[PDB]
């Protein structure tokens, strides 16, 4: 029975239950709504999107990646919340394919709606989809190719993959140069899998071509007054002390005086203690000093008299990457000047770019940190460029970890679709119908990928289907003229692990969402 047509509604105010078909209608309609809201960023012609803040903040951002929309969007449909959860999972896994897995899930749900309207049970659909996913995964691994051993081929595949990632973004104008720059940046880590080490800056104005890579480090903390402005070839030490009005941590201590003479004596004692601490710091043999918290007037005056620069407002990430790139060691007790390693740098300077004073590091010792200069007229294009660069770094790291790759741009999509169609016509029953709907969603993904360019779909899809039937498993759609051809020679390749992860995530999300039959609601607040 259903509570929709019942003598009583056992609910509080605002809580309701709806008929099974209506419940799935609402859930899957919310899911497909979020799906086509994230849609239209597929392919190299993906249109950008503004991430506006409805509140008084009014923070306006633009991005071509749909995951940014997913992380910052209001949630109404519970299935939409499930979709954003799985998409965030995929994004934390790999930096590309998040919008791909989201749109695949949205389609799978909309043809699930259509197929249930076609009088098919959800369990049969789930079984057919599981069979089709197994077939698609086996086909994808059959055509998967790894070329990590060959260093020249590995570098060429890195070129292709970074170009693939940047094609969907607006940076396609300098795609090749930014590609070689990012590949050099990722190889600068000497096989290190971390990505927070690579740091980026923002500078208003200038052409996009002005963007480049800095091998050293870029710093944007001001220098003191009395200390000399520029001293090179110094030793840099990182400290975790407050370095401001240092007082006894004992809570119960208090001062009880009968006259101002003892007050002045205590003030002089505090000044002498601060001077002793300053001398203890200077005992380390340091000229460029780095601090986290504030530095007051007396210590900065003492540093200026000592001719030693103190750098404040160095946050945890900044000191982290500075230690990674120079080998400096963080310290909190300065009673052992020789027991803490000091940072080694070749050249330090305070460059003047734009209308700001930026400290630039050159000749870093360890080199385990990359600093990238990005130039843009507006902050929006700047953040879009940095997000695209970060996604490129993520996909490059994923390729470095495993070099198993496949031919994308609809090519491997046609492989999967062909395998699933072959199995569907091989098998009888409504499971075949469900998994053929799976296959048609698979085919319609690159359909809209290409149609985002205002091109034709059916002719190219049929041509690629026929060519891959002939055995042209390396044939893929070319965005340059909206035509077909050898996908590899276009220099556009996709990692096999990313494709497999996207396929599995979409399959599992569709399976878990489809099993929902009825929606029950508690009392809203």
């Amino acid at each position: 029975a259903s509570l929709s047509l019942a003598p009583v509604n056992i609910f509080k105010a605002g809580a309701d239950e709806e008929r099974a078909e209506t419940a799935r209608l609402t859930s899957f309609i919310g899911a497909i709504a979020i799906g086509d809201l994230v849609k239209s960023t597929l392919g190299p012609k993906g249109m950008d999107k503004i991430l506006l803040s409805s509140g008084r903040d009014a923070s306006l951002m633009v991005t071509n990646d749909g995951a940014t929309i997913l992380k910052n969007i209001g949630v109404d449909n519970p299935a939409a919340k499930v979709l954003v959860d799985m998409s965030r999972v995929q994004d934390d896994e790999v930096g590309d394919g998040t919008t791909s897995v989201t749109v695949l899930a949205a389609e799978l749900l909309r043809e699930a709606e259509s197929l249930i309207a076609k009088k098919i049970h959800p369990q049969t659909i789930i079984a057919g989809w599981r069979e089709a996913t197994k077939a698609a995964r086996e086909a994808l691994l059959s055509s998967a190719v790894d070329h990590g051993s060959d260093e020249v081929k590995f570098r060429q595949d890195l070129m292709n993959i970074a170009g693939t990632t940047l094609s969907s973004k607006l940076l396609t104008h300098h795609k090749d140069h930014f590609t070689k720059l990012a590949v050099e940046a990722v190889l600068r880590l000497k096989g290190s899998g971390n990505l927070e080490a690579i740091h980026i800056i923002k500078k208003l104005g200038g052409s996009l071509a002005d963007s480049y890579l800095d091998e050293g480090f870029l710093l944007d903390k001001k220098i003191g007054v009395n200390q000399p402005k520029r001293i090179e070839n110094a030793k840099i030490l990182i400290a975790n002390t407050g370095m401001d009005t240092d007082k006894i941590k004992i809570f119960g201590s208090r001062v009880r005086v009968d006259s101002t003479a003892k007050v002045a004596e205590i003030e002089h004692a505090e000044k002498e203690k601060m001077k002793e601490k300053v001398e203890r710091i200077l005992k380390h043999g340091i000229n460029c000093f780095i601090n986290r918290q504030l530095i007051y007037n007396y210590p900065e005056q003492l540093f200026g008299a000592a001719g030693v620069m103190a750098i404040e407002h160095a946050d945890f990430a900044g000191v982290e990457r500075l230690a990674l790139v120079t080998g400096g060691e963080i310290a909190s007790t300065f009673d052992h000047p020789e027991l803490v390693k000091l940072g080694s740098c070749k050249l330090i300077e305070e460059v003047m770019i734009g209308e700001d004073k930026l400290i630039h590091f050159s000749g870093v010792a360890l080199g385990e940190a990359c600093t990238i200069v990005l130039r843009g007229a507006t902050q929006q294009i700047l953040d879009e460029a940095e997000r695209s660069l970060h996604d490129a770094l993520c996909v490059l790291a994923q390729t470095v970890k495993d070099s198993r790759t496949v031919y994308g741009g609809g090519c491997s999509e046609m492989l999967m679709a062909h395998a699933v169609t072959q199995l569907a016509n091989r098998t009888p029953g409504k499971e075949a119908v469900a998994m053929e709907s799976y296959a048609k969603a698979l085919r319609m993904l690159p359909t809209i990928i290409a149609d985002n360019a205002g091109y034709d779909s059916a002719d190219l899809v049929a041509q690629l289907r026929a060519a891959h039937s002939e055995g042209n498993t390396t044939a893929g759609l070319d965005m340059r003229e909206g035509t077909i051809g050898d996908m590899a020679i276009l220099g556009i390749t996709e990692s096999f692990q990313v494709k497999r992860q996207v396929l599995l995530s979409a399959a599992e999300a569709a399976e878990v969402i489809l099993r929902v039959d009825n929606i029950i609601k508690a009392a809203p607040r």
Binding site: A1, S2, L3, A6, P7, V8, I10, F11, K12, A15, K81, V82, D85, M86, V89, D92, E93, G95, H121, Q123, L195, E196, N240, T241, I248, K249, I250, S253, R254, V255, R256, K262, I266, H268, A269, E270, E320, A323, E329, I330, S332, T333, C394, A397, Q398, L504, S505, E508, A509, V512, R515, V516, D517, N518, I519, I520, K521, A523, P524, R525
Partner: protein, 540 residues
Amino acid sequence: ASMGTLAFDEYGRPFLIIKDQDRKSRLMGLEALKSHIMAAKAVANTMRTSLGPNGLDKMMVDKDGDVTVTNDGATILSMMDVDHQIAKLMVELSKSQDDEIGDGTTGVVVLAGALLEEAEQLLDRGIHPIRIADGYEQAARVAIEHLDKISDSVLVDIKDTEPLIQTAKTTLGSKVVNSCHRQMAEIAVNAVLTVADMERRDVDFELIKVEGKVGGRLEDTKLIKGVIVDKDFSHPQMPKKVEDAKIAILTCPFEPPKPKTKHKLDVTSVEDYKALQKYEKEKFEEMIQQIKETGANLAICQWGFDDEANHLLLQNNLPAVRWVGGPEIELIAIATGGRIVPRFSELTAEKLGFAGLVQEISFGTTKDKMLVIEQCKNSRAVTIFIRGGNKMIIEEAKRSLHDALCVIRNLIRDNRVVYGGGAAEISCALAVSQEADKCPTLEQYAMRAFADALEVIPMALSENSGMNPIQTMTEVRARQVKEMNPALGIDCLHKGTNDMKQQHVIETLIGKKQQISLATQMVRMILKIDDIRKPGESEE
């Protein structure tokens, strides 16, 4: 029996009976019982769809906006906006069945639903609930006797778990995790047998936690015979991997303890200030030397430490963590065999637990790592790590492993088991029909009511899948007449055979008898209650 009573006295004066009677719907008697039974009707019909492997999964959005997609009925209905006390009574019924067995919580609700289904027509015929309840109790005794008659038991002990593996796979077939049923059955049985007591004692579930992180693939779900620590090392250059570590239990911050009562210290002169400074410095020195005296590898701080202590630990190259929860401290102390340490006074190398292996685990570009502890020679705690494509499949895996481990615990408790999937239900229906044919006539209506009530389980199993219910019902009943067997029932997975035993489906007999008894008792209690008070003011 609505909007109060209309009398207006009897000489024309205004009349008052009950407070707020202008719109009070006064509910006593047979119509009140109709109201309660129909509310239970709604609850049961909304809940019953989660029965059987083909049974679908309900979702709920709580008062806090958190979703929950679930297959196990107990947790499906455990968070319902219950208003009438009968629904709450069914909730405690489900809870009692769940903590008594763990599986079959759906069975009691559906059975009570069908019992009330025919009870309401019996009430419409004009039958007072007392004789209905007595007939229902007689019927429950008959059903329990049949269940005892058709029992069959096998070996369950720790040495052999192949029937346990089959039972776990059968139980998890109803859940979405049925893709890798063999893998989850094997890992679950390994987890439960990692630490267990076979002398009819409880297994420490405090030490067995089902926790995992999102990402990866479902088949990556693997068992970690140890402890999972969320926190990470504070220093960048600090080493991330330590082997053969010793756990230093610490329950005090790395700062000089302060007096509990309010205190005042008078610092007046330069000498006093310098003396306090050097006293505090020597207190840090004493504390750091006391910490280093034990020589432990890993130090676990509940109250953390400051920057100076962090640097001192860095120079000493002694791995340590900060701000760890108390229950986690208890778990790690039990697993590593550590001892309670109040402060540096009782800190020594002889009261340190041992961790076999400690590692930092990375899951790609997240900047959020975790600490895994395993390989302990005396590990008293074992945890199962589950991977999934999203947090809600993770939760579904959590509850599926929970139910599988509950089934394993029930099997360990006793080997008295039976065959489910409606076959035993059909046998019970046959027994109740026989009792109706061989017992006084007036209560035979309650007899056949209870029979039709027990008949709903194959009803729901069939209509969940989609086969024709009643033809299968009649055919299986005829075959069971031909041969007595609790293994002739519905082929939900369309395997083509009605031999339920051949399909390796095992459930505890204690669970089924408790299900029947609990359902009968709850139905009897609800039959005898006809009082609920409502104001019904229709506020605006």
